[PDB]
Protein backbone atom coordinates (compact mmCIF):
# COMPACT_ATOMS: atom_id res chain seq x y z
CA UNK A 1 0.00 0.00 0.00
CA UNK A 2 3.06 2.24 0.13
CA UNK A 3 3.42 2.31 -3.66
CA UNK A 4 1.71 2.30 -7.06
CA UNK A 5 4.90 1.12 -8.83
CA UNK A 6 3.34 -2.24 -9.89
CA UNK A 7 0.84 -0.20 -11.96
CA UNK A 8 3.16 2.50 -13.29
CA UNK A 9 3.58 1.20 -16.84
CA UNK A 10 0.01 0.00 -17.35
CA UNK A 11 -1.56 3.19 -15.98
CA UNK A 12 0.76 5.38 -18.08
CA UNK A 13 -0.26 3.46 -21.18
CA UNK A 14 -3.95 3.71 -20.19
CA UNK A 15 -3.76 7.47 -19.57
CA UNK A 16 -2.15 7.95 -23.00
CA UNK A 17 -4.71 5.71 -24.72
CA UNK A 18 -7.54 7.71 -23.14
CA UNK A 19 -6.07 11.03 -24.33
CA UNK A 20 -5.52 9.65 -27.86
CA UNK A 21 -9.16 8.54 -28.03
CA UNK A 22 -10.83 11.61 -26.46
CA UNK A 23 -8.52 14.61 -27.07
CA UNK A 24 -6.46 13.54 -30.12
CA UNK A 25 -4.73 16.93 -30.44
CA UNK A 26 -1.27 16.68 -28.93
CA UNK A 27 0.27 19.25 -26.57
CA UNK A 28 3.11 21.37 -27.92
CA UNK A 29 5.91 22.97 -25.92
CA UNK A 30 6.41 26.72 -25.82
CA UNK A 31 10.04 27.54 -26.59
CA UNK A 32 11.36 30.55 -24.69
CA UNK A 33 14.29 32.42 -26.15
CA UNK A 34 17.44 32.47 -24.04
CA UNK A 35 16.57 36.09 -23.23
CA UNK A 36 13.07 35.17 -22.07
CA UNK A 37 14.23 32.22 -19.97
CA UNK A 38 16.84 34.42 -18.28
CA UNK A 39 14.29 37.15 -17.51
CA UNK A 40 11.97 34.50 -16.03
CA UNK A 41 14.70 32.99 -13.86
CA UNK A 42 15.95 36.41 -12.71
CA UNK A 43 12.41 37.32 -11.60
CA UNK A 44 12.02 33.98 -9.82
CA UNK A 45 15.30 34.46 -7.94
CA UNK A 46 14.43 38.05 -7.03
CA UNK A 47 11.06 36.99 -5.60
CA UNK A 48 12.34 34.18 -3.33
CA UNK A 49 15.54 35.93 -2.23
CA UNK A 50 13.87 37.65 0.79
CA UNK A 51 13.12 34.13 2.04
CA UNK A 52 16.82 33.22 2.01
CA UNK A 53 16.34 30.27 -0.35
CA UNK A 54 18.77 29.43 -3.13
CA UNK A 55 17.37 27.52 -6.10
CA UNK A 56 19.39 26.38 -9.09
CA UNK A 57 18.58 27.13 -12.71
CA UNK A 58 17.94 23.40 -13.14
CA UNK A 59 15.28 23.44 -10.43
CA UNK A 60 13.63 26.53 -11.94
CA UNK A 61 13.59 24.83 -15.35
CA UNK A 62 11.94 21.73 -13.87
CA UNK A 63 9.25 23.85 -12.19
CA UNK A 64 8.59 25.89 -15.33
CA UNK A 65 8.16 22.87 -17.62
CA UNK A 66 4.49 22.48 -16.69
CA UNK A 67 3.81 26.00 -17.99
CA UNK A 68 5.79 25.40 -21.17
CA UNK A 69 3.83 22.21 -21.90
CA UNK A 70 0.34 22.92 -20.54
CA UNK A 71 -0.58 26.26 -22.11
CA UNK A 72 -2.04 26.42 -25.65
CA UNK A 73 0.67 27.80 -27.96
CA UNK A 74 -1.48 28.34 -31.05
CA UNK A 75 -3.81 30.67 -29.09
CA UNK A 76 -1.18 32.73 -27.23
CA UNK A 77 -1.48 36.46 -27.80
CA UNK A 78 0.36 38.03 -24.84
CA UNK A 79 3.86 36.72 -24.04
CA UNK A 80 4.23 39.11 -21.08
CA UNK A 81 1.27 37.39 -19.43
CA UNK A 82 2.87 34.06 -20.40
CA UNK A 83 6.13 34.96 -18.65
CA UNK A 84 4.13 36.09 -15.60
CA UNK A 85 2.56 32.63 -15.34
CA UNK A 86 6.04 31.10 -15.68
CA UNK A 87 7.31 33.19 -12.76
CA UNK A 88 4.20 32.89 -10.56
CA UNK A 89 3.99 29.13 -11.07
CA UNK A 90 7.66 28.67 -10.17
CA UNK A 91 7.82 30.89 -7.11
CA UNK A 92 4.59 29.50 -5.62
CA UNK A 93 5.85 25.99 -6.35
CA UNK A 94 8.90 26.83 -4.24
CA UNK A 95 6.59 28.19 -1.52
CA UNK A 96 4.47 25.02 -1.77
CA UNK A 97 7.65 22.95 -1.21
CA UNK A 98 8.82 24.89 1.83
CA UNK A 99 8.54 24.13 5.51
CA UNK A 100 5.73 26.39 6.82
CA UNK A 101 8.21 27.69 9.42
CA UNK A 102 10.01 29.51 6.59
CA UNK A 103 6.73 31.00 5.32
CA UNK A 104 6.95 34.80 5.64
CA UNK A 105 3.88 36.44 4.12
CA UNK A 106 5.12 39.96 4.85
CA UNK A 107 8.20 39.29 2.69
CA UNK A 108 6.62 37.09 -0.01
CA UNK A 109 3.28 38.76 -0.78
CA UNK A 110 4.87 42.07 -1.90
CA UNK A 111 7.05 40.04 -4.28
CA UNK A 112 3.98 38.40 -5.83
CA UNK A 113 2.43 41.84 -6.24
CA UNK A 114 5.59 43.11 -7.94
CA UNK A 115 5.48 40.25 -10.47
CA UNK A 116 1.80 40.88 -11.22
CA UNK A 117 2.29 44.63 -11.63
CA UNK A 118 5.22 44.14 -14.03
CA UNK A 119 3.53 41.80 -16.52
CA UNK A 120 -0.21 42.54 -16.37
CA UNK A 121 -2.38 45.57 -16.92
CA UNK A 122 -3.87 47.10 -13.78
CA UNK A 123 -7.09 45.08 -13.73
CA UNK A 124 -5.51 41.71 -14.61
CA UNK A 125 -2.70 42.39 -12.13
CA UNK A 126 -5.23 42.60 -9.28
CA UNK A 127 -7.01 39.43 -10.38
CA UNK A 128 -3.80 37.44 -10.71
CA UNK A 129 -2.46 38.77 -7.42
CA UNK A 130 -5.64 37.93 -5.47
CA UNK A 131 -5.59 34.39 -6.85
CA UNK A 132 -1.92 33.95 -5.94
CA UNK A 133 -2.61 35.38 -2.49
CA UNK A 134 -5.61 33.10 -1.97
CA UNK A 135 -3.55 30.10 -3.09
CA UNK A 136 -0.54 30.57 -0.81
CA UNK A 137 -2.82 31.54 2.09
CA UNK A 138 -4.87 28.37 1.53
CA UNK A 139 -1.66 26.32 1.42
CA UNK A 140 -0.62 27.73 4.81
CA UNK A 141 -4.10 27.52 6.40
CA UNK A 142 -4.68 23.85 5.64
CA UNK A 143 -1.37 22.33 6.77
CA UNK A 144 -2.40 20.17 9.74
CA UNK A 145 -6.05 21.21 9.52
CA UNK A 146 -9.05 19.04 10.46
CA UNK A 147 -10.82 20.44 7.39
CA UNK A 148 -8.18 18.97 5.07
CA UNK A 149 -8.52 15.63 6.84
CA UNK A 150 -12.31 15.63 6.47
CA UNK A 151 -12.32 16.63 2.80
CA UNK A 152 -9.48 14.33 1.73
CA UNK A 153 -10.71 11.16 3.50
CA UNK A 154 -14.51 11.32 3.07
CA UNK A 155 -15.20 10.73 -0.64
CA UNK A 156 -13.74 11.55 -4.06
CA UNK A 157 -16.37 14.30 -4.37
CA UNK A 158 -15.19 16.14 -1.23
CA UNK A 159 -11.56 15.57 -2.16
CA UNK A 160 -11.81 17.13 -5.62
CA UNK A 161 -13.83 20.00 -4.14
CA UNK A 162 -10.83 20.78 -1.93
CA UNK A 163 -8.36 20.40 -4.81
CA UNK A 164 -10.05 23.05 -6.99
CA UNK A 165 -8.08 25.53 -4.89
CA UNK A 166 -5.39 23.31 -3.38
CA UNK A 167 -3.89 21.91 -6.59
CA UNK A 168 -3.63 25.50 -7.83
CA UNK A 169 -5.87 25.26 -10.87
CA UNK A 170 -8.17 28.15 -9.92
CA UNK A 171 -5.03 30.29 -9.48
CA UNK A 172 -3.69 28.96 -12.81
CA UNK A 173 -6.84 29.98 -14.70
CA UNK A 174 -6.97 33.43 -13.14
CA UNK A 175 -3.36 34.22 -14.06
CA UNK A 176 -3.55 32.56 -17.50
CA UNK A 177 -6.60 34.20 -19.13
CA UNK A 178 -4.61 37.37 -20.11
CA UNK A 179 -2.36 35.13 -22.24
CA UNK A 180 -5.26 34.45 -24.59
CA UNK A 181 -7.35 37.65 -24.40
CA UNK A 182 -10.40 35.53 -25.22
CA UNK A 183 -13.63 36.93 -23.75
CA UNK A 184 -15.41 33.62 -23.04
CA UNK A 185 -12.29 32.04 -21.51
CA UNK A 186 -11.80 35.14 -19.36
CA UNK A 187 -15.32 34.77 -17.93
CA UNK A 188 -14.98 31.03 -17.23
CA UNK A 189 -11.67 31.77 -15.49
CA UNK A 190 -13.25 34.44 -13.31
CA UNK A 191 -16.30 32.33 -12.31
CA UNK A 192 -13.87 29.43 -11.66
CA UNK A 193 -15.97 27.20 -13.95
CA UNK A 194 -12.70 26.78 -15.92
CA UNK A 195 -10.97 25.43 -12.81
CA UNK A 196 -13.89 23.23 -11.80
CA UNK A 197 -13.99 21.63 -15.28
CA UNK A 198 -10.26 20.79 -15.31
CA UNK A 199 -9.63 19.91 -11.63
CA UNK A 200 -10.21 16.14 -11.84
CA UNK A 201 -8.08 15.60 -14.96
CA UNK A 202 -5.14 17.52 -13.48
CA UNK A 203 -5.50 16.07 -10.00
CA UNK A 204 -5.86 12.39 -10.89
CA UNK A 205 -2.72 12.52 -13.04
CA UNK A 206 -0.80 14.49 -10.43
CA UNK A 207 -1.98 12.13 -7.69
CA UNK A 208 -1.00 8.93 -9.47
CA UNK A 209 2.57 10.01 -10.24
CA UNK A 210 3.18 11.68 -6.86
CA UNK A 211 1.54 8.98 -4.69
CA UNK A 212 4.74 7.15 -3.71
CA UNK A 213 6.52 10.37 -2.73
CA UNK A 214 3.54 11.83 -0.89
CA UNK A 215 2.64 8.77 1.19
CA UNK A 216 6.30 8.44 2.18
CA UNK A 217 6.11 11.98 3.62
CA UNK A 218 2.83 11.33 5.47
CA UNK A 219 0.83 13.63 3.18
CA UNK A 220 -2.87 12.85 2.74
CA UNK A 221 -3.84 15.05 -0.24
CA UNK A 222 -3.95 12.26 -2.84
CA UNK A 223 -7.11 10.56 -4.10
CA UNK A 224 -5.39 7.14 -4.32
CA UNK A 225 -5.26 7.01 -0.51
CA UNK A 226 -9.05 6.56 -0.80
CA UNK A 227 -8.49 3.03 -2.11
CA UNK A 228 -6.32 0.08 -1.09
CA UNK A 229 -3.56 0.29 -3.69
CA UNK A 230 -2.18 -3.04 -2.42
CA UNK A 231 -5.37 -4.83 -3.60
CA UNK A 232 -4.96 -5.15 -7.36
CA UNK A 233 -8.70 -5.67 -7.85
CA UNK A 234 -9.61 -2.66 -5.68
CA UNK A 235 -6.98 -0.45 -7.31
CA UNK A 236 -8.15 -1.37 -10.80
CA UNK A 237 -11.79 -0.54 -10.04
CA UNK A 238 -10.77 2.78 -8.48
CA UNK A 239 -8.44 3.69 -11.35
CA UNK A 240 -11.19 2.93 -13.88
CA UNK A 241 -13.59 5.15 -11.91
CA UNK A 242 -11.06 8.00 -12.08
CA UNK A 243 -10.54 7.42 -15.82
CA UNK A 244 -14.33 7.60 -16.23
CA UNK A 245 -14.31 10.91 -14.30
CA UNK A 246 -11.66 12.32 -16.65
CA UNK A 247 -13.58 11.17 -19.73
CA UNK A 248 -16.88 12.63 -18.52
CA UNK A 249 -15.17 15.98 -17.91
CA UNK A 250 -13.38 15.91 -21.26
CA UNK A 251 -16.62 15.18 -23.10
CA UNK A 252 -18.35 18.10 -21.35
CA UNK A 253 -15.36 20.33 -22.06
CA UNK A 254 -16.03 19.75 -25.76
CA UNK A 255 -19.29 21.69 -25.39
CA UNK A 256 -17.33 24.88 -24.70
CA UNK A 257 -16.24 27.18 -27.53
CA UNK A 258 -13.34 25.98 -29.69
CA UNK A 259 -10.60 28.20 -28.21
CA UNK A 260 -11.71 27.58 -24.63
CA UNK A 261 -11.81 23.83 -25.06
CA UNK A 262 -8.33 23.81 -26.66
CA UNK A 263 -6.95 25.63 -23.60
CA UNK A 264 -8.70 23.28 -21.14
CA UNK A 265 -7.64 20.11 -22.95
CA UNK A 266 -4.07 21.28 -23.67
CA UNK A 267 -3.86 21.96 -19.92
CA UNK A 268 -4.97 18.46 -18.84
CA UNK A 269 -3.06 16.63 -21.59
CA UNK A 270 0.04 18.86 -21.36
CA UNK A 271 0.19 18.30 -17.62
CA UNK A 272 0.25 14.54 -18.25
CA UNK A 273 3.04 14.88 -20.85
CA UNK A 274 5.17 17.01 -18.53
CA UNK A 275 4.53 14.79 -15.49
CA UNK A 276 5.71 11.65 -17.31
CA UNK A 277 8.60 13.35 -19.16
CA UNK B 1 -45.06 14.29 -20.46
CA UNK B 2 -47.57 15.61 -17.92
CA UNK B 3 -46.62 13.03 -15.28
CA UNK B 4 -43.08 14.46 -15.26
CA UNK B 5 -44.36 18.03 -15.02
CA UNK B 6 -44.88 18.11 -11.23
CA UNK B 7 -43.42 17.10 -7.88
CA UNK B 8 -46.75 17.93 -6.18
CA UNK B 9 -47.42 14.28 -5.09
CA UNK B 10 -44.16 14.36 -3.11
CA UNK B 11 -44.54 17.88 -1.74
CA UNK B 12 -45.63 17.06 1.81
CA UNK B 13 -43.42 14.00 2.28
CA UNK B 14 -40.29 15.68 0.92
CA UNK B 15 -40.92 18.78 3.05
CA UNK B 16 -41.21 16.59 6.12
CA UNK B 17 -38.07 14.64 5.23
CA UNK B 18 -36.04 17.81 4.61
CA UNK B 19 -37.06 19.12 8.04
CA UNK B 20 -36.30 15.78 9.70
CA UNK B 21 -32.81 15.79 8.19
CA UNK B 22 -32.10 19.32 9.43
CA UNK B 23 -33.39 18.46 12.92
CA UNK B 24 -31.08 15.45 13.15
CA UNK B 25 -28.00 16.98 11.50
CA UNK B 26 -28.00 20.76 12.06
CA UNK B 27 -30.23 21.10 15.16
CA UNK B 28 -29.75 24.86 15.48
CA UNK B 29 -32.81 26.59 14.06
CA UNK B 30 -32.55 29.61 11.73
CA UNK B 31 -33.48 33.00 13.14
CA UNK B 32 -34.80 35.97 11.21
CA UNK B 33 -32.97 39.28 10.99
CA UNK B 34 -35.53 42.00 11.56
CA UNK B 35 -34.81 45.33 9.92
CA UNK B 36 -36.16 48.56 11.33
CA UNK B 37 -38.68 50.28 9.09
CA UNK B 38 -35.99 52.86 8.34
CA UNK B 39 -33.48 50.17 7.35
CA UNK B 40 -36.02 48.36 5.18
CA UNK B 41 -37.08 51.61 3.50
CA UNK B 42 -33.42 52.43 2.78
CA UNK B 43 -32.87 48.97 1.28
CA UNK B 44 -35.95 49.19 -0.95
CA UNK B 45 -35.09 52.73 -2.09
CA UNK B 46 -31.62 51.57 -3.15
CA UNK B 47 -33.26 48.64 -4.95
CA UNK B 48 -35.63 50.98 -6.81
CA UNK B 49 -32.81 53.37 -7.72
CA UNK B 50 -30.74 50.45 -9.04
CA UNK B 51 -33.40 49.01 -11.40
CA UNK B 52 -35.13 52.23 -12.50
CA UNK B 53 -32.72 52.80 -15.45
CA UNK B 54 -34.08 49.56 -16.92
CA UNK B 55 -37.69 50.78 -16.70
CA UNK B 56 -38.69 48.37 -13.92
CA UNK B 57 -41.25 49.38 -11.31
CA UNK B 58 -41.19 47.03 -8.30
CA UNK B 59 -43.63 47.21 -5.39
CA UNK B 60 -42.45 47.03 -1.77
CA UNK B 61 -44.27 43.70 -1.43
CA UNK B 62 -42.28 42.15 -4.29
CA UNK B 63 -39.00 43.48 -2.85
CA UNK B 64 -39.84 42.01 0.57
CA UNK B 65 -40.44 38.61 -1.05
CA UNK B 66 -37.01 38.79 -2.69
CA UNK B 67 -35.20 39.96 0.46
CA UNK B 68 -36.68 37.31 2.79
CA UNK B 69 -33.91 34.89 1.83
CA UNK B 70 -31.25 37.28 3.19
CA UNK B 71 -33.25 37.89 6.37
CA UNK B 72 -33.52 34.14 7.03
CA UNK B 73 -30.29 32.68 5.67
CA UNK B 74 -27.62 34.86 7.27
CA UNK B 75 -26.32 34.12 10.79
CA UNK B 76 -27.67 36.79 13.18
CA UNK B 77 -25.59 35.78 16.17
CA UNK B 78 -22.41 36.55 14.19
CA UNK B 79 -23.36 39.80 12.44
CA UNK B 80 -20.88 42.61 13.01
CA UNK B 81 -21.46 44.95 10.03
CA UNK B 82 -25.09 45.85 9.29
CA UNK B 83 -23.96 48.10 6.43
CA UNK B 84 -22.56 44.99 4.73
CA UNK B 85 -25.80 43.20 5.61
CA UNK B 86 -27.90 45.89 3.93
CA UNK B 87 -25.65 45.68 0.86
CA UNK B 88 -26.34 41.94 0.65
CA UNK B 89 -30.05 42.79 0.92
CA UNK B 90 -29.85 45.22 -2.00
CA UNK B 91 -27.56 43.13 -4.21
CA UNK B 92 -29.60 39.98 -3.72
CA UNK B 93 -32.83 41.78 -4.60
CA UNK B 94 -31.62 43.70 -7.64
CA UNK B 95 -29.84 40.71 -9.14
CA UNK B 96 -32.95 38.64 -8.39
CA UNK B 97 -34.93 41.04 -10.58
CA UNK B 98 -32.24 40.83 -13.26
CA UNK B 99 -32.42 37.04 -13.00
CA UNK B 100 -36.20 37.20 -13.57
CA UNK B 101 -36.13 39.76 -16.36
CA UNK B 102 -36.66 39.41 -20.07
CA UNK B 103 -33.09 38.88 -21.37
CA UNK B 104 -33.98 41.44 -24.05
CA UNK B 105 -34.28 44.15 -21.38
CA UNK B 106 -30.76 43.29 -20.12
CA UNK B 107 -28.67 46.49 -20.39
CA UNK B 108 -25.23 45.94 -18.89
CA UNK B 109 -24.26 49.56 -19.62
CA UNK B 110 -27.04 50.82 -17.35
CA UNK B 111 -27.06 48.06 -14.71
CA UNK B 112 -23.39 47.39 -13.93
CA UNK B 113 -22.76 51.02 -12.80
CA UNK B 114 -25.71 50.72 -10.41
CA UNK B 115 -24.17 47.58 -8.90
CA UNK B 116 -20.86 49.36 -8.42
CA UNK B 117 -22.71 52.26 -6.76
CA UNK B 118 -24.34 49.91 -4.24
CA UNK B 119 -20.98 48.28 -3.48
CA UNK B 120 -19.20 51.61 -3.05
CA UNK B 121 -21.92 52.89 -0.70
CA UNK B 122 -21.90 50.00 1.75
CA UNK B 123 -18.45 48.35 1.72
CA UNK B 124 -14.92 49.51 2.32
CA UNK B 125 -12.75 49.97 -0.77
CA UNK B 126 -11.27 46.47 -0.98
CA UNK B 127 -14.52 44.66 -0.10
CA UNK B 128 -16.47 46.79 -2.57
CA UNK B 129 -14.25 45.52 -5.41
CA UNK B 130 -14.67 41.89 -4.33
CA UNK B 131 -18.45 42.18 -4.00
CA UNK B 132 -18.73 44.05 -7.31
CA UNK B 133 -16.62 41.54 -9.25
CA UNK B 134 -18.71 38.66 -7.91
CA UNK B 135 -21.96 40.43 -8.82
CA UNK B 136 -20.52 41.24 -12.24
CA UNK B 137 -19.46 37.62 -12.87
CA UNK B 138 -22.87 36.35 -11.72
CA UNK B 139 -25.01 38.56 -13.96
CA UNK B 140 -22.61 38.01 -16.86
CA UNK B 141 -22.77 34.24 -16.35
CA UNK B 142 -26.58 34.43 -16.32
CA UNK B 143 -26.46 36.21 -19.69
CA UNK B 144 -23.76 33.97 -21.21
CA UNK B 145 -25.58 30.72 -20.53
CA UNK B 146 -29.10 31.47 -21.76
CA UNK B 147 -29.45 29.12 -24.76
CA UNK B 148 -25.90 27.92 -24.32
CA UNK B 149 -24.85 24.41 -25.34
CA UNK B 150 -22.60 24.41 -22.26
CA UNK B 151 -25.61 24.73 -19.95
CA UNK B 152 -27.33 21.83 -21.73
CA UNK B 153 -24.26 19.59 -21.36
CA UNK B 154 -23.61 20.40 -17.71
CA UNK B 155 -27.28 20.18 -16.73
CA UNK B 156 -28.14 16.89 -18.44
CA UNK B 157 -24.99 14.79 -17.98
CA UNK B 158 -24.79 13.92 -14.27
CA UNK B 159 -25.50 15.47 -10.85
CA UNK B 160 -21.76 16.15 -10.54
CA UNK B 161 -21.59 18.28 -13.70
CA UNK B 162 -24.87 19.97 -12.76
CA UNK B 163 -23.78 21.04 -9.29
CA UNK B 164 -20.47 22.20 -10.78
CA UNK B 165 -22.47 24.57 -13.00
CA UNK B 166 -24.65 25.73 -10.08
CA UNK B 167 -21.75 26.85 -7.85
CA UNK B 168 -21.89 30.01 -9.94
CA UNK B 169 -25.34 29.83 -11.50
CA UNK B 170 -27.47 29.63 -8.32
CA UNK B 171 -25.43 32.53 -6.98
CA UNK B 172 -23.80 31.02 -3.90
CA UNK B 173 -20.27 32.07 -4.89
CA UNK B 174 -21.60 35.62 -5.31
CA UNK B 175 -23.44 35.33 -1.96
CA UNK B 176 -20.28 34.28 -0.09
CA UNK B 177 -18.17 37.00 -1.64
CA UNK B 178 -20.61 39.77 -0.70
CA UNK B 179 -21.41 38.31 2.75
CA UNK B 180 -18.00 37.85 4.37
CA UNK B 181 -17.77 41.58 5.39
CA UNK B 182 -20.92 41.04 7.49
CA UNK B 183 -18.96 38.72 9.82
CA UNK B 184 -15.37 40.08 9.70
CA UNK B 185 -14.16 36.57 10.47
CA UNK B 186 -10.71 35.84 8.94
CA UNK B 187 -11.24 32.12 8.23
CA UNK B 188 -14.69 32.68 6.73
CA UNK B 189 -13.31 35.50 4.59
CA UNK B 190 -10.65 33.14 3.17
CA UNK B 191 -13.14 30.33 2.49
CA UNK B 192 -15.37 32.85 0.69
CA UNK B 193 -12.49 34.15 -1.44
CA UNK B 194 -11.26 30.66 -2.46
CA UNK B 195 -14.93 29.68 -3.15
CA UNK B 196 -14.58 26.63 -0.87
CA UNK B 197 -17.44 28.23 1.09
CA UNK B 198 -19.58 28.18 -2.03
CA UNK B 199 -18.48 24.68 -3.02
CA UNK B 200 -19.46 23.31 0.44
CA UNK B 201 -22.95 24.85 0.41
CA UNK B 202 -23.97 24.52 -3.28
CA UNK B 203 -25.73 21.15 -3.05
CA UNK B 204 -27.69 21.93 0.12
CA UNK B 205 -28.93 25.19 -1.40
CA UNK B 206 -29.53 23.84 -4.91
CA UNK B 207 -31.40 20.64 -3.99
CA UNK B 208 -33.90 22.60 -1.88
CA UNK B 209 -34.26 25.36 -4.47
CA UNK B 210 -34.70 22.80 -7.25
CA UNK B 211 -37.34 20.76 -5.46
CA UNK B 212 -39.59 23.74 -4.68
CA UNK B 213 -39.12 25.50 -8.03
CA UNK B 214 -39.41 22.35 -10.18
CA UNK B 215 -43.03 22.87 -11.29
CA UNK B 216 -42.56 26.50 -12.27
CA UNK B 217 -39.25 25.92 -14.06
CA UNK B 218 -40.36 22.96 -16.17
CA UNK B 219 -43.52 24.91 -17.03
CA UNK B 220 -41.23 27.59 -18.46
CA UNK B 221 -38.99 25.16 -20.36
CA UNK B 222 -36.03 25.80 -18.03
CA UNK B 223 -33.50 22.98 -17.66
CA UNK B 224 -31.44 24.14 -14.68
CA UNK B 225 -32.99 21.77 -12.15
CA UNK B 226 -31.48 18.54 -10.84
CA UNK B 227 -34.85 16.79 -10.67
CA UNK B 228 -34.93 16.75 -14.47
CA UNK B 229 -32.16 14.15 -14.15
CA UNK B 230 -34.71 11.65 -12.86
CA UNK B 231 -38.19 10.54 -13.90
CA UNK B 232 -40.33 12.37 -11.36
CA UNK B 233 -43.36 10.51 -12.78
CA UNK B 234 -41.85 7.23 -11.49
CA UNK B 235 -42.35 7.11 -7.72
CA UNK B 236 -39.65 4.47 -7.31
CA UNK B 237 -37.13 6.36 -9.45
CA UNK B 238 -38.00 9.68 -7.81
CA UNK B 239 -37.66 8.36 -4.26
CA UNK B 240 -34.27 6.78 -5.05
CA UNK B 241 -33.07 10.04 -6.63
CA UNK B 242 -34.39 12.12 -3.74
CA UNK B 243 -32.63 9.83 -1.24
CA UNK B 244 -29.35 10.23 -3.12
CA UNK B 245 -29.79 14.01 -2.93
CA UNK B 246 -30.56 13.81 0.77
CA UNK B 247 -27.35 11.77 1.17
CA UNK B 248 -25.44 14.51 -0.67
CA UNK B 249 -26.77 17.14 1.73
CA UNK B 250 -25.92 15.04 4.78
CA UNK B 251 -22.37 14.38 3.58
CA UNK B 252 -21.84 18.11 2.97
CA UNK B 253 -23.29 19.04 6.37
CA UNK B 254 -21.15 16.47 8.18
CA UNK B 255 -18.04 17.79 6.42
CA UNK B 256 -19.07 21.39 7.16
CA UNK B 257 -18.87 20.47 10.85
CA UNK B 258 -15.08 20.14 10.48
CA UNK B 259 -14.80 23.90 9.84
CA UNK B 260 -14.27 26.38 12.69
CA UNK B 261 -17.34 27.08 14.82
CA UNK B 262 -18.31 30.49 13.43
CA UNK B 263 -17.81 29.39 9.80
CA UNK B 264 -19.89 26.27 10.24
CA UNK B 265 -22.64 28.31 11.94
CA UNK B 266 -22.77 30.58 8.88
CA UNK B 267 -22.71 27.71 6.34
CA UNK B 268 -25.46 25.77 8.15
CA UNK B 269 -27.64 28.84 8.85
CA UNK B 270 -27.48 29.52 5.11
CA UNK B 271 -28.56 26.04 4.03
CA UNK B 272 -31.21 25.64 6.74
CA UNK B 273 -32.41 29.26 6.54
CA UNK B 274 -32.88 28.95 2.79
CA UNK B 275 -35.10 25.92 3.35
CA UNK B 276 -37.22 27.75 5.96
CA UNK B 277 -37.66 30.79 3.71
CA UNK B 278 -38.37 28.61 0.67
CA UNK B 279 -41.20 26.74 2.44
CA UNK B 280 -42.76 29.83 4.00
CL1 LIG C 1 -10.46 41.26 -7.07
MG1 LIG D 1 0.84 15.43 -5.85
MG1 LIG E 1 -34.88 27.06 -9.07
Author numbering:
A (entry chain A): 15 to 291
B (entry chain B): 12 to 291
Q: How is this structure described in the published paper?
A:
To elucidate the dynamic interactions of TPSs with their substrates during catalysis, we investigated the bacterial diterpene synthase CotB2 as a model system. The CotB2 protein sequence exhibits a modified aspartate-rich DDXD motif12 deviating from the conventional DDXXD motif and the NSE triad NDXXSXX(R,K)(E,D) as found in bacteria and fungi, that is altered to a DTE triad in plants.
To comprehend the state of the CotB2wt•Mg2+B•GGSDP structure, we determined the structure of CotB2F107A under a Mg2+-rich condition (CotB2F107A•Mg2+B). The position of the Mg2+B matches perfectly with that in the CotB2wt•Mg2+B•GGSDP structure. Moreover, the conformation of the Mg2+B coordinating amino acids are oriented in the same manner as there are two water molecules in our structure that mimic the oxygens of the diphosphate group in CotB2wt•Mg2+B•GGSDP. In the structure of CotB2F107A•Mg2+B the salt-bridge of D111 and R294 has not yet been established and the remaining C-terminus could not be resolved. This suggests, that the accurate positioning of the diphosphate moiety is required for the formation of the latter salt-bridge. The overall structure of CotB2wt•Mg2+B•GGSDP is most similar to CotB2wt and CotB2F107A•Mg2+B as indicated by a low root-mean-square deviation. Hence, the structures are likely different pre-catalytic states of CotB2. The CotB2 mutation F107A afforded cembrene A as a product.
